[PDB]
């Protein structure tokens, strides 16, 4: 399954970057993962099919807002109130299986995008 | 009717294992099993020694409502 | 709202039971299945005198092998044997019974130790079996320490990552429900109460747009758990009706062939769950089950994990099982596989002389990288399918 990310460039701290990922086909769980440069990858947020199937990593809670258009196979991350650590590459990911909460780890997701890099400025 | 390896319950005729013929457990329906009758290995921490048996059991098995010791010592005084 | 899954057509239920029926005459220890007995006793169907012989065989096999044999029943299977006793309105008793209880308690204690106080360490079997063991003991009114419950209480919270199994969450939830109804572990009562709600929410969040909770085969156990308690604030009624729709479609499309799966579904179709084994109703009327009176297919078998790698096209009659394709591959040459007995059915221990190690299983997949939801005997491949066997780490 193909996943194509969009949005996300050069923001001053405090924030408001929206983000997007569209998929060729319906998927079970779709999530977002951020990689700090040189530091593996970190889970950011899931969103399974129904309602608030929203799962958040404790770092982003209160900025957050993962959302999912099931009609258009497209997920989104509002990412308000951005900070130093939020600088990273953000990858969209998907898996055809809906499981018991918090997949969190990589390896549980089969399909990945190329990523949008996001960068936050101190001044 | 019954192999040497297995005791034959009377009345039922059911063949049950020869062990259990005298296990103080009434395995046959009539009870024909019972009526016809008749240097040391250290334990972990957080285990009890059974008062009379070799056996060791988690110390949480003390007064849990079930006799885990052959002597049943894990369930004897059993009051605050 | 309540989870109510209304009765399916009696004909449809009957044909499910007829799938179980041949197993009533398979009394060898490799085929004895306490889950089949339980599922049937909790159903609206019965096998008459065959049931009594089946239970007798279970008690002969399990007590002789564990306390004294081709193989031995695992501890997880011993837990299901305990459910079978409840299904006949029996409490495990006598000196043999007491010993069996302590063996199951030792299983839980060993898994507790394996998990650790850090909680980093994995159990040697699954959290599913850990929950099943607690449930089985609780059903016979045998207490387990709060420290044992806590492992499961943790394993159920969404971000825990021990497992991501709707079946395990449902079984846990079932274990937690038995503890709560029995007023066991009062020093964990609030956490047990909260854990039940947690499992409810996570299961209702695993619902598929089709209606299933996780997978068609997770839905039965999930429904068993959801049926045991109200869920205020949530629309449990709606979720469960959507699941029946999904369940009905799956049934009419022949999804349920496996005996264990049927044994987990039949109680649901009779408005019963494993929690009904606390106060069993053994004399409730049940309908007597009576025995229910060419194309060539090529399937590609691929084993990339092994070196040298294996890709071959195997020609079999249509409706053939993955095991049937595997058997042909052995006859043609260059393929060896090994299988071990399970209550679900054959389990693939080895492919081509490589046998999975600890935390390793041979996954069954159909390209592209889609894991199969059915076993080698149950799954029948469509023409042109590529069936892959991959060693993977769980
Ligand atoms: C735990 C887990 C589970 N699994 Co696996 C999963 N995920 N499983 C297993 C582990 C198992 C390993 C362990 N040490 O426990 C695990 C992950 C490696 C295994 C592997 C998969 N599993 C399988 C699925 C499909 C089955 N498994 C379940 C039985 C699914 C179970 C859920 C359920 N509803 O029962 C499950 C939660 C609990 C199994 C249990 O302990 N039962 C209690 C025990 C007392 O009974 P038992 O029979 O003696 O348990 C043994 C067997 O279950 C066997 N086993 C496990 N899965 C299967 C599947 C089949 C088809 C067969 C014949 C045996 C097994 O392993 C256990 C020995 O430890 C099943 C309901 C899960 C599900 N909802 O999808 C599913 C069967 C669906 C069906 N139509 O029957 C796989 C085929 C997936 C795949 N494509 O590879 C595969 C089996 C491949 C093979 N080599 O033959
Ligand atoms: Ca006896
Ligand atoms: Ca005790």
JSON list of C-alpha atoms in Angstrom, two decimals, chain C residues 15-154:
[
{"chain": "C", "resi": 15, "resn": "UNK", "atom": "CA", "xyz": [-24.45, -27.04, 11.32]},
{"chain": "C", "resi": 16, "resn": "UNK", "atom": "CA", "xyz": [-21.79, -25.45, 13.53]},
{"chain": "C", "resi": 17, "resn": "UNK", "atom": "CA", "xyz": [-22.41, -28.13, 16.14]},
{"chain": "C", "resi": 18, "resn": "UNK", "atom": "CA", "xyz": [-22.23, -30.87, 13.50]},
{"chain": "C", "resi": 19, "resn": "UNK", "atom": "CA", "xyz": [-18.65, -29.76, 12.82]},
{"chain": "C", "resi": 20, "resn": "UNK", "atom": "CA", "xyz": [-17.84, -30.52, 16.47]},
{"chain": "C", "resi": 21, "resn": "UNK", "atom": "CA", "xyz": [-19.64, -33.84, 16.51]},
{"chain": "C", "resi": 22, "resn": "UNK", "atom": "CA", "xyz": [-16.97, -36.07, 14.87]},
{"chain": "C", "resi": 23, "resn": "UNK", "atom": "CA", "xyz": [-14.51, -34.99, 17.57]},
{"chain": "C", "resi": 24, "resn": "UNK", "atom": "CA", "xyz": [-16.75, -36.57, 20.21]},
{"chain": "C", "resi": 25, "resn": "UNK", "atom": "CA", "xyz": [-15.49, -39.99, 19.06]},
{"chain": "C", "resi": 26, "resn": "UNK", "atom": "CA", "xyz": [-11.83, -39.01, 18.91]},
{"chain": "C", "resi": 27, "resn": "UNK", "atom": "CA", "xyz": [-10.72, -39.87, 22.44]},
{"chain": "C", "resi": 28, "resn": "UNK", "atom": "CA", "xyz": [-6.98, -40.33, 21.93]},
{"chain": "C", "resi": 29, "resn": "UNK", "atom": "CA", "xyz": [-4.98, -37.96, 24.12]},
{"chain": "C", "resi": 30, "resn": "UNK", "atom": "CA", "xyz": [-3.55, -36.16, 21.08]},
{"chain": "C", "resi": 31, "resn": "UNK", "atom": "CA", "xyz": [-7.11, -35.29, 20.05]},
{"chain": "C", "resi": 32, "resn": "UNK", "atom": "CA", "xyz": [-8.81, -34.83, 23.45]},
{"chain": "C", "resi": 33, "resn": "UNK", "atom": "CA", "xyz": [-9.98, -31.25, 23.69]},
{"chain": "C", "resi": 34, "resn": "UNK", "atom": "CA", "xyz": [-11.41, -29.76, 26.92]},
{"chain": "C", "resi": 35, "resn": "UNK", "atom": "CA", "xyz": [-12.40, -26.60, 25.03]},
{"chain": "C", "resi": 36, "resn": "UNK", "atom": "CA", "xyz": [-14.70, -28.62, 22.76]},
{"chain": "C", "resi": 37, "resn": "UNK", "atom": "CA", "xyz": [-16.48, -30.15, 25.78]},
{"chain": "C", "resi": 38, "resn": "UNK", "atom": "CA", "xyz": [-16.90, -26.75, 27.44]},
{"chain": "C", "resi": 39, "resn": "UNK", "atom": "CA", "xyz": [-18.16, -25.08, 24.28]},
{"chain": "C", "resi": 40, "resn": "UNK", "atom": "CA", "xyz": [-20.74, -27.82, 23.77]},
{"chain": "C", "resi": 41, "resn": "UNK", "atom": "CA", "xyz": [-22.02, -27.80, 27.38]},
{"chain": "C", "resi": 42, "resn": "UNK", "atom": "CA", "xyz": [-22.46, -24.02, 27.20]},
{"chain": "C", "resi": 43, "resn": "UNK", "atom": "CA", "xyz": [-24.28, -24.29, 23.87]},
{"chain": "C", "resi": 44, "resn": "UNK", "atom": "CA", "xyz": [-27.91, -25.04, 22.99]},
{"chain": "C", "resi": 45, "resn": "UNK", "atom": "CA", "xyz": [-26.67, -28.33, 21.51]},
{"chain": "C", "resi": 46, "resn": "UNK", "atom": "CA", "xyz": [-25.72, -31.68, 23.03]},
{"chain": "C", "resi": 47, "resn": "UNK", "atom": "CA", "xyz": [-24.12, -34.99, 22.04]},
{"chain": "C", "resi": 48, "resn": "UNK", "atom": "CA", "xyz": [-25.96, -37.07, 24.65]},
{"chain": "C", "resi": 49, "resn": "UNK", "atom": "CA", "xyz": [-24.13, -40.04, 26.15]},
{"chain": "C", "resi": 50, "resn": "UNK", "atom": "CA", "xyz": [-21.04, -39.26, 24.04]},
{"chain": "C", "resi": 51, "resn": "UNK", "atom": "CA", "xyz": [-20.39, -36.31, 26.37]},
{"chain": "C", "resi": 52, "resn": "UNK", "atom": "CA", "xyz": [-20.08, -38.48, 29.46]},
{"chain": "C", "resi": 53, "resn": "UNK", "atom": "CA", "xyz": [-17.52, -40.73, 27.77]},
{"chain": "C", "resi": 54, "resn": "UNK", "atom": "CA", "xyz": [-15.65, -37.64, 26.60]},
{"chain": "C", "resi": 55, "resn": "UNK", "atom": "CA", "xyz": [-15.40, -36.23, 30.12]},
{"chain": "C", "resi": 56, "resn": "UNK", "atom": "CA", "xyz": [-14.36, -39.63, 31.42]},
{"chain": "C", "resi": 57, "resn": "UNK", "atom": "CA", "xyz": [-11.55, -39.73, 28.84]},
{"chain": "C", "resi": 58, "resn": "UNK", "atom": "CA", "xyz": [-10.48, -36.22, 29.87]},
{"chain": "C", "resi": 59, "resn": "UNK", "atom": "CA", "xyz": [-10.25, -37.19, 33.55]},
{"chain": "C", "resi": 60, "resn": "UNK", "atom": "CA", "xyz": [-8.37, -40.41, 32.74]},
{"chain": "C", "resi": 61, "resn": "UNK", "atom": "CA", "xyz": [-5.86, -38.68, 30.49]},
{"chain": "C", "resi": 62, "resn": "UNK", "atom": "CA", "xyz": [-5.23, -35.50, 32.44]},
{"chain": "C", "resi": 63, "resn": "UNK", "atom": "CA", "xyz": [-4.96, -37.00, 35.92]},
{"chain": "C", "resi": 64, "resn": "UNK", "atom": "CA", "xyz": [-2.78, -40.00, 34.94]},
{"chain": "C", "resi": 65, "resn": "UNK", "atom": "CA", "xyz": [-0.38, -38.08, 32.74]},
{"chain": "C", "resi": 66, "resn": "UNK", "atom": "CA", "xyz": [0.11, -34.97, 35.01]},
{"chain": "C", "resi": 67, "resn": "UNK", "atom": "CA", "xyz": [0.13, -36.71, 38.47]},
{"chain": "C", "resi": 68, "resn": "UNK", "atom": "CA", "xyz": [1.73, -40.13, 37.81]},
{"chain": "C", "resi": 69, "resn": "UNK", "atom": "CA", "xyz": [1.13, -41.74, 28.40]},
{"chain": "C", "resi": 70, "resn": "UNK", "atom": "CA", "xyz": [1.60, -40.33, 24.91]},
{"chain": "C", "resi": 71, "resn": "UNK", "atom": "CA", "xyz": [2.61, -36.76, 25.70]},
{"chain": "C", "resi": 72, "resn": "UNK", "atom": "CA", "xyz": [1.34, -34.76, 28.67]},
{"chain": "C", "resi": 73, "resn": "UNK", "atom": "CA", "xyz": [-1.28, -32.03, 28.75]},
{"chain": "C", "resi": 74, "resn": "UNK", "atom": "CA", "xyz": [0.28, -28.57, 29.07]},
{"chain": "C", "resi": 75, "resn": "UNK", "atom": "CA", "xyz": [-0.59, -26.39, 32.05]},
{"chain": "C", "resi": 76, "resn": "UNK", "atom": "CA", "xyz": [-2.67, -24.14, 29.79]},
{"chain": "C", "resi": 77, "resn": "UNK", "atom": "CA", "xyz": [-4.61, -27.21, 28.68]},
{"chain": "C", "resi": 78, "resn": "UNK", "atom": "CA", "xyz": [-4.98, -28.22, 32.34]},
{"chain": "C", "resi": 79, "resn": "UNK", "atom": "CA", "xyz": [-6.67, -24.86, 32.89]},
{"chain": "C", "resi": 80, "resn": "UNK", "atom": "CA", "xyz": [-9.22, -25.66, 30.17]},
{"chain": "C", "resi": 81, "resn": "UNK", "atom": "CA", "xyz": [-9.71, -29.09, 31.72]},
{"chain": "C", "resi": 82, "resn": "UNK", "atom": "CA", "xyz": [-10.69, -27.22, 34.89]},
{"chain": "C", "resi": 83, "resn": "UNK", "atom": "CA", "xyz": [-13.31, -25.31, 32.87]},
{"chain": "C", "resi": 84, "resn": "UNK", "atom": "CA", "xyz": [-14.57, -28.67, 31.63]},
{"chain": "C", "resi": 85, "resn": "UNK", "atom": "CA", "xyz": [-15.13, -29.78, 35.23]},
{"chain": "C", "resi": 86, "resn": "UNK", "atom": "CA", "xyz": [-17.22, -26.66, 35.92]},
{"chain": "C", "resi": 87, "resn": "UNK", "atom": "CA", "xyz": [-19.20, -27.39, 32.74]},
{"chain": "C", "resi": 88, "resn": "UNK", "atom": "CA", "xyz": [-20.29, -30.61, 34.44]},
{"chain": "C", "resi": 89, "resn": "UNK", "atom": "CA", "xyz": [-21.05, -28.82, 37.75]},
{"chain": "C", "resi": 90, "resn": "UNK", "atom": "CA", "xyz": [-17.99, -30.29, 39.46]},
{"chain": "C", "resi": 91, "resn": "UNK", "atom": "CA", "xyz": [-15.39, -28.69, 41.67]},
{"chain": "C", "resi": 92, "resn": "UNK", "atom": "CA", "xyz": [-11.88, -30.05, 41.37]},
{"chain": "C", "resi": 93, "resn": "UNK", "atom": "CA", "xyz": [-11.51, -32.22, 44.45]},
{"chain": "C", "resi": 94, "resn": "UNK", "atom": "CA", "xyz": [-9.83, -35.11, 46.24]},
{"chain": "C", "resi": 95, "resn": "UNK", "atom": "CA", "xyz": [-6.10, -35.64, 46.58]},
{"chain": "C", "resi": 96, "resn": "UNK", "atom": "CA", "xyz": [-5.54, -35.87, 42.84]},
{"chain": "C", "resi": 97, "resn": "UNK", "atom": "CA", "xyz": [-7.67, -32.75, 42.33]},
{"chain": "C", "resi": 98, "resn": "UNK", "atom": "CA", "xyz": [-5.76, -30.79, 44.98]},
{"chain": "C", "resi": 99, "resn": "UNK", "atom": "CA", "xyz": [-2.46, -31.71, 43.32]},
{"chain": "C", "resi": 100, "resn": "UNK", "atom": "CA", "xyz": [-3.67, -30.57, 39.92]},
{"chain": "C", "resi": 101, "resn": "UNK", "atom": "CA", "xyz": [-4.64, -27.21, 41.42]},
{"chain": "C", "resi": 102, "resn": "UNK", "atom": "CA", "xyz": [-1.18, -26.73, 42.92]},
{"chain": "C", "resi": 103, "resn": "UNK", "atom": "CA", "xyz": [0.44, -27.63, 39.61]},
{"chain": "C", "resi": 104, "resn": "UNK", "atom": "CA", "xyz": [-1.56, -24.87, 37.90]},
{"chain": "C", "resi": 105, "resn": "UNK", "atom": "CA", "xyz": [-0.64, -22.50, 40.75]},
{"chain": "C", "resi": 106, "resn": "UNK", "atom": "CA", "xyz": [3.03, -23.41, 40.16]},
{"chain": "C", "resi": 107, "resn": "UNK", "atom": "CA", "xyz": [2.59, -22.59, 36.47]},
{"chain": "C", "resi": 108, "resn": "UNK", "atom": "CA", "xyz": [1.37, -19.11, 37.40]},
{"chain": "C", "resi": 109, "resn": "UNK", "atom": "CA", "xyz": [4.11, -18.63, 39.98]},
{"chain": "C", "resi": 110, "resn": "UNK", "atom": "CA", "xyz": [6.79, -19.58, 37.42]},
{"chain": "C", "resi": 111, "resn": "UNK", "atom": "CA", "xyz": [5.34, -17.19, 34.84]},
{"chain": "C", "resi": 112, "resn": "UNK", "atom": "CA", "xyz": [5.23, -14.46, 37.50]},
{"chain": "C", "resi": 113, "resn": "UNK", "atom": "CA", "xyz": [8.93, -15.07, 38.20]},
{"chain": "C", "resi": 114, "resn": "UNK", "atom": "CA", "xyz": [9.74, -15.10, 34.48]},
{"chain": "C", "resi": 115, "resn": "UNK", "atom": "CA", "xyz": [7.94, -11.78, 33.97]},
{"chain": "C", "resi": 116, "resn": "UNK", "atom": "CA", "xyz": [9.92, -10.30, 36.86]},
{"chain": "C", "resi": 117, "resn": "UNK", "atom": "CA", "xyz": [9.54, -7.33, 39.25]},
{"chain": "C", "resi": 118, "resn": "UNK", "atom": "CA", "xyz": [11.01, -5.00, 36.58]},
{"chain": "C", "resi": 119, "resn": "UNK", "atom": "CA", "xyz": [8.09, -6.31, 34.40]},
{"chain": "C", "resi": 120, "resn": "UNK", "atom": "CA", "xyz": [10.60, -6.31, 31.50]},
{"chain": "C", "resi": 121, "resn": "UNK", "atom": "CA", "xyz": [10.79, -10.13, 31.28]},
{"chain": "C", "resi": 122, "resn": "UNK", "atom": "CA", "xyz": [8.31, -12.04, 29.02]},
{"chain": "C", "resi": 123, "resn": "UNK", "atom": "CA", "xyz": [6.27, -15.08, 30.17]},
{"chain": "C", "resi": 124, "resn": "UNK", "atom": "CA", "xyz": [7.40, -18.49, 28.79]},
{"chain": "C", "resi": 125, "resn": "UNK", "atom": "CA", "xyz": [3.96, -18.94, 27.29]},
{"chain": "C", "resi": 126, "resn": "UNK", "atom": "CA", "xyz": [1.58, -16.03, 26.67]},
{"chain": "C", "resi": 127, "resn": "UNK", "atom": "CA", "xyz": [-0.41, -13.53, 28.70]},
{"chain": "C", "resi": 128, "resn": "UNK", "atom": "CA", "xyz": [-3.41, -15.34, 27.20]},
{"chain": "C", "resi": 129, "resn": "UNK", "atom": "CA", "xyz": [-2.49, -18.50, 29.11]},
{"chain": "C", "resi": 130, "resn": "UNK", "atom": "CA", "xyz": [-1.61, -16.44, 32.19]},
{"chain": "C", "resi": 131, "resn": "UNK", "atom": "CA", "xyz": [-5.15, -14.99, 32.20]},
{"chain": "C", "resi": 132, "resn": "UNK", "atom": "CA", "xyz": [-6.68, -18.38, 31.39]},
{"chain": "C", "resi": 133, "resn": "UNK", "atom": "CA", "xyz": [-4.90, -19.92, 34.38]},
{"chain": "C", "resi": 134, "resn": "UNK", "atom": "CA", "xyz": [-6.16, -17.25, 36.78]},
{"chain": "C", "resi": 135, "resn": "UNK", "atom": "CA", "xyz": [-9.68, -17.65, 35.41]},
{"chain": "C", "resi": 136, "resn": "UNK", "atom": "CA", "xyz": [-9.61, -21.46, 35.73]},
{"chain": "C", "resi": 137, "resn": "UNK", "atom": "CA", "xyz": [-8.50, -21.29, 39.38]},
{"chain": "C", "resi": 138, "resn": "UNK", "atom": "CA", "xyz": [-11.03, -18.57, 40.18]},
{"chain": "C", "resi": 139, "resn": "UNK", "atom": "CA", "xyz": [-13.89, -20.65, 38.68]},
{"chain": "C", "resi": 140, "resn": "UNK", "atom": "CA", "xyz": [-13.07, -23.35, 41.21]},
{"chain": "C", "resi": 141, "resn": "UNK", "atom": "CA", "xyz": [-12.89, -20.74, 43.97]},
{"chain": "C", "resi": 142, "resn": "UNK", "atom": "CA", "xyz": [-9.16, -21.01, 44.40]},
{"chain": "C", "resi": 143, "resn": "UNK", "atom": "CA", "xyz": [-7.40, -17.80, 45.33]},
{"chain": "C", "resi": 144, "resn": "UNK", "atom": "CA", "xyz": [-4.31, -16.28, 43.75]},
{"chain": "C", "resi": 145, "resn": "UNK", "atom": "CA", "xyz": [-2.11, -13.60, 45.26]},
{"chain": "C", "resi": 146, "resn": "UNK", "atom": "CA", "xyz": [-2.55, -9.91, 44.42]},
{"chain": "C", "resi": 147, "resn": "UNK", "atom": "CA", "xyz": [1.02, -9.95, 43.11]},
{"chain": "C", "resi": 148, "resn": "UNK", "atom": "CA", "xyz": [-0.14, -12.46, 40.43]},
{"chain": "C", "resi": 149, "resn": "UNK", "atom": "CA", "xyz": [-3.18, -10.41, 39.44]},
{"chain": "C", "resi": 150, "resn": "UNK", "atom": "CA", "xyz": [-0.95, -7.33, 39.03]},
{"chain": "C", "resi": 151, "resn": "UNK", "atom": "CA", "xyz": [0.96, -8.77, 36.07]},
{"chain": "C", "resi": 152, "resn": "UNK", "atom": "CA", "xyz": [-2.34, -9.14, 34.19]},
{"chain": "C", "resi": 153, "resn": "UNK", "atom": "CA", "xyz": [-3.64, -5.78, 35.44]},
{"chain": "C", "resi": 154, "resn": "UNK", "atom": "CA", "xyz": [-0.58, -4.21, 33.78]}
]
